[PDB]
Design a protein around this motif. Sequence first.
Motif, short mmCIF file in Angstrom:
data_model
loop_
_atom_site.label_atom_id
_atom_site.label_comp_id
_atom_site.label_asym_id
_atom_site.label_seq_id
_atom_site.Cartn_x
_atom_site.Cartn_y
_atom_site.Cartn_z
N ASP A 21 0.84 -1.35 0.03
CA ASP A 21 -0.01 0.15 -0.18
C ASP A 21 0.97 1.14 -0.01
O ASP A 21 1.51 1.46 -1.10
CB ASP A 21 -1.00 -0.18 1.24
CG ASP A 21 -1.98 -0.98 1.29
OD1 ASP A 21 -2.60 -1.28 0.28
OD2 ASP A 21 -2.10 -1.88 1.97
N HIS A 77 -9.61 -3.52 -3.49
CA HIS A 77 -8.43 -2.84 -3.10
C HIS A 77 -7.73 -4.07 -1.87
O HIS A 77 -7.97 -3.95 -0.86
CB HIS A 77 -8.40 -1.44 -2.26
CG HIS A 77 -7.10 -1.04 -1.73
ND1 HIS A 77 -6.15 -0.75 -2.79
CD2 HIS A 77 -6.43 -1.01 -0.73
CE1 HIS A 77 -5.06 -0.07 -2.27
NE2 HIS A 77 -5.12 -0.32 -0.77
N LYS A 124 -5.43 -6.23 0.17
CA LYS A 124 -4.12 -6.14 0.96
C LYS A 124 -3.48 -7.07 1.01
O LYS A 124 -2.31 -7.30 1.74
CB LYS A 124 -4.61 -5.59 2.25
CG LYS A 124 -3.64 -5.43 3.37
CD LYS A 124 -3.93 -4.92 4.63
CE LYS A 124 -2.75 -4.66 5.75
NZ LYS A 124 -3.12 -3.95 6.85
#
Lengths: 513, 513, 513
Positions: free
Chosen positions: B177, B355, B357
Amino acid sequence: VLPENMKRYMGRDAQRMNILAGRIIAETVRSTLGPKGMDKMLVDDLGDVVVTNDGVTILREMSVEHPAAKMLIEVAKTQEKEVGDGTTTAVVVAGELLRKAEELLDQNVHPTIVVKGYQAAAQKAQELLKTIACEVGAQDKEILTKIAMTSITGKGAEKAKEKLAEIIVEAVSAVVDDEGKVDKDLIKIEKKSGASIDDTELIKGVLVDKERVSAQMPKKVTDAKIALLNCAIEIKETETDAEIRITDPAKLMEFIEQEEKMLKDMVAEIKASGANVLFCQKGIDDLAQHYLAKEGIVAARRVKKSDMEKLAKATGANVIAAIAALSAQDLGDAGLVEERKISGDSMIFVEECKHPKAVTMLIRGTTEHVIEEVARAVDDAVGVVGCTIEDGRIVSGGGSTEVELSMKLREYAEGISGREQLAVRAFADALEVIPRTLAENAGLDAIEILVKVRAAHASNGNKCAGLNVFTGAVEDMCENGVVEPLRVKTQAIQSAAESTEMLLRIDDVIAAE
Amino acid sequence: VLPENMKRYMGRDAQRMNILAGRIIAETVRSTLGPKGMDKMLVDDLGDVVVTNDGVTILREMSVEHPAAKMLIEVAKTQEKEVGDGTTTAVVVAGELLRKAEELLDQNVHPTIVVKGYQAAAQKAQELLKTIACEVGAQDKEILTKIAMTSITGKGAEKAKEKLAEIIVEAVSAVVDDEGKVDKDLIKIEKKSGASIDDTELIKGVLVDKERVSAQMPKKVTDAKIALLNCAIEIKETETDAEIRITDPAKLMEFIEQEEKMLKDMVAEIKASGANVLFCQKGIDDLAQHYLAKEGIVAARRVKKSDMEKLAKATGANVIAAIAALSAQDLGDAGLVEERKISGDSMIFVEECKHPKAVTMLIRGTTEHVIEEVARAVDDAVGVVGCTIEDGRIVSGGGSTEVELSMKLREYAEGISGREQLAVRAFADALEVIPRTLAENAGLDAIEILVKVRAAHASNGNKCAGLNVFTGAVEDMCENGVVEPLRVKTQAIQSAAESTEMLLRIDDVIAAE
Amino acid sequence: VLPENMKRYMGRDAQRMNILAGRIIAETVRSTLGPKGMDKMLVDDLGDVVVTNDGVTILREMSVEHPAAKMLIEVAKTQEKEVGDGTTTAVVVAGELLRKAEELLDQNVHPTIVVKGYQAAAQKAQELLKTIACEVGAQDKEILTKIAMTSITGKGAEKAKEKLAEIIVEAVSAVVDDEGKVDKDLIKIEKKSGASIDDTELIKGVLVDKERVSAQMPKKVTDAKIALLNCAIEIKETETDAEIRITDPAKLMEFIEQEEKMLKDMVAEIKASGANVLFCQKGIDDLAQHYLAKEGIVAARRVKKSDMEKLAKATGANVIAAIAALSAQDLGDAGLVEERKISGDSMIFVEECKHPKAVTMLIRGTTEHVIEEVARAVDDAVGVVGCTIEDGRIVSGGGSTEVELSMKLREYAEGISGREQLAVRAFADALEVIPRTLAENAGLDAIEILVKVRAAHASNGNKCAGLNVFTGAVEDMCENGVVEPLRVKTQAIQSAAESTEMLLRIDDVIAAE
């Protein structure tokens, strides 16, 4: 192919065992190296206990298993014969060369390159020795006394190194005659407890640990006429089988008296020669011993063949087989032959020979083990004192030589280049073991002396350097009389380099279980 | 004091065993070092056979006896965690340091001086690393691809090092990130035989080796709403001890149907949440599996806790204990969840997360043992690719680093002086093991490259040197993209120097018979 | 009288074995003594390997057979509790006292005279310690930093002795509160690999190696209200035997939901207290973990009882048995509670406590074994830093104390006279082992320093002497900040003298075969 159970080493394993074999020998023996070196204590299979610092004695007596360790022993043996001393030194430098060689094998240096570099570096080391060799008088009192002295040191005998140096240089000077060749066989090393080491003394003739066969015999004979018989002084018996056959009561008496008559006549012939001192290699019948005593002839029986030869060379006596063959021309001369008690033991002193080619050195000391070490010590002193007369070059001690060779062999390596240079670099660095191990036994800082000695040597020279373990600092070995025969160092480098390289040339060991 | 039979090492014997322990480990593992390094074959007590080149795996699995060897293992373990790769490198340099250290102990360098010199030389080596460290973009595509590539090489995976480098730098870039912190837990390493290595591919989501519990369930769900349950989907049983007591023929029927009614209602609640993809950590009753299928909910039971966590992070799903607790806000999102046959085996692909992770890398290859090595290989690639983002310094390979450190540490030693300098000199020379062992495994002339590389490095620099084992000559490692994270080298020097010095600080080993 | 096979020592044999037992322990442990001391490597019966320099650890872990050796261990144990460090020192001086005592027994000094002289000489040594004791500020930053520093030295931790000294004097200053009493229980020693030693840091609160039971729970809570529960957060089961008997299909549903309702209500009560950070000594049901997360309460289960107590003292939280018993007045306060990854591992940092009576020190380092030694090292630092606050007297190191005591005890012996004086003379001379063994491990000339230090000490004083092993020469220990707590030296003399004399009072040992 090999019997099941037989053990074999090969390649780097053959090299691993071989390096360990020589390295362990050197690792254990190096603690004897130098004036401040210690002693080993070897106990035989029967319990016999020997205490020594001599590398040869240690290696000969100890029970060696490794084949490579058995090869290095020969290096120490050739040192014993050629120079006598430096026996440990030869082993130590060889072990270090093997220590460095194993690293080079680990460094992926082909076995043929290692042995090439060592052969090359040793060939240069030989030239370097011949280049630093210092010309001295072959029979110069002073330099002979220094050679003799330095050999004596580091042993129990060093307590009287001044007296002992004088003794040895006089002995070797007497027996060598012309310039020259020295033969250790000409100097007998006798030892008998009592007195101290300073009381050790050289007899210009032959001292034997024998006594006069009859109490009636004179205890001292001047202007002595020495006879050397090998046959026994008894009723000679014919070679062909023969027996007497008595058949008359008169003949029983005749033959018994005829035996006594023969033996009496035999003695009469000994006397007829002009001989009055007699050494018989074999026995002497009690009847003959008496008649010898009455003719004023002193005699000793069962004389060691080795003593019979030392008597011939000293007195100029001729070794005669048969009594009948004795004549005045076969007799040797001695100024005085006298029977003396040494530590109570009866010994015969044959001294004041006209021109002795053989002399006897009697070693004294407080105990058997003291005179034992001294007798060993002076054997080596004779070796190195003999070296200086034959080869009139000597070199300074204190490891200064090997320091000179280290520096020039490092320069040599640079000229060689390739991978071969590493072998020459390692050979050069290996030569540093000498000042390093001297210091370890002396308890000196190895690192400090190695910096100070190497620098001081390179600038000041070889006749103005070396390490003095006695004060524990760099000094002038040459000025301090710390010199050894060239032979010591060149024979060390010779035998060590060839046997060391030979071990490195072995790639395969086949040994029984 | 110690029980008769217990074995103890002390002084130079404790050091002898300790050096041999680490030296043997290094001697055996160093043959894995470098692009041209080989593999070891470890066979367990059960017969399980593992083939690897990773120092950690080798040390963890093998049966070590020596305590000192057990200490070095920790060095390799800290390397695995911090950087992943260079695990062998850390051991090798440590072993050589111990090899040199033993010589220094033999050179009569006091144990406190050896450890002083190493602590000093390692402190300078740390500064020297920080001085040659090359600043690169923490997320730069290019340098990341080079880091990833160099790790991959020397393994079976290098056949597709171009594809694999791209895969890893994309995976680590996705999960990291912000700038930044990388956690290996975010990238799953899955392997399934079939296809080739080039076919290895990254799935931006979670790939699990599970299947849909009912044949009736849809095989693909788009805009997936993922639910994470930990409890089992069965008739919940009360915590307090409780039993039903039926006493009416009507109740026999009521309770049996009431069990089915509960489980049906449980499924109705799962559906009520809006969930249509379901992962249950525990089991699912066959009755519930059916009703799930009829509600159009796909499900997989007995899901690994580790998978449940990777699903939470990827989809943004919240791990929920009880079914009743499910809600739309606790659900995660995935673009597509599809059940596919990979090498015939049923697997679930949860991909196209909004998104993610957490991502999953599926490794392909011709055989189990191929994908086995690759799965290990890319684990290390993730390690080193993660290092570059956190610590934006890298350094050139080909042993050029250690060559820079060798030269400057030799200069450092000169400033130190005394006996302490020898320890620093040996430390510096020990760092040469890297280019030397690389060459041995490459089959290159160690002596030649050591002269040419050292000289060429010193003149041309560090960003213009090193040894290229692929052409077998000095080249430009940096230009050729042969770079590794600074962490690799500094962590190698760190753990190795401290554990190596620690071993050298140990003078006494007390071990059971 | 004794079973055939049982072994017994008596008279000088009981003394022979007893002296050898303590002498061997001291002979092996003394190599750890001092800044330049080494480490021992203990291997357990299971294979567990521990590396340490701490006398206590060494003695506790090793397998001791001799009964007398088992007695000396207690001396080291009382040192650990009272001061922490100097554990080796206490053993060494005891062993030397026993070494001298055996000579006195051989010197025909009656066993009652030896123990009389030692009791007398130790009584004077106690007075002499109280006479040379230097008054310092109980909480003075400077002297505390010097105490802390000197303890740290001679260990791997000395690399950051400046940072570590600051850390410990701050920790002990926080938890001690008033002047004063220090309890080691108030300072937790936590270790987690990663970073270096300089990165070790003190947290003014509690650091536990726990994680938040649900992923949904906030990762950081400010103005934290900490609750301490000991009971498990599950459906409480009655003490009296009880079972539910369901007989209605409606009740099957009621009770299952009633279980969930109870546990939900339990969580509601936890929230009702005002608590938002929760530590449960026992387990937490998954259902409760969720509801806790939804109420914004962070929680950790299975919390070590020891951690529960450190939390109570730090935050001022009250340890509560039942959830129902929770109230705002029972809650503790922390400024921030945050879950952080330390070396990847999830840990909870409870920091910024208002007035913490308990603090936690987190040790960092390159490897597990590094932080292992440091964690041991700082335990001792806490010990000695605690000593200075309670007993505001310290004394200089470098063996200067024992030198003062040696001189005055020799003068004391002269006043005693008779045969008793020899025991006092031997006691005085035995105290010289300290500077002597420090030098042996330092590699210094024992004889030189003993002449120069003793003379220089006697003239210049105690606050201007001692041996500096770091430069290897007599220096000013006091000026150089080389000081230790009085307790170290007086407790060493106390426990050693009494246990040493006790061993000397034993004349008869009866041990199984």
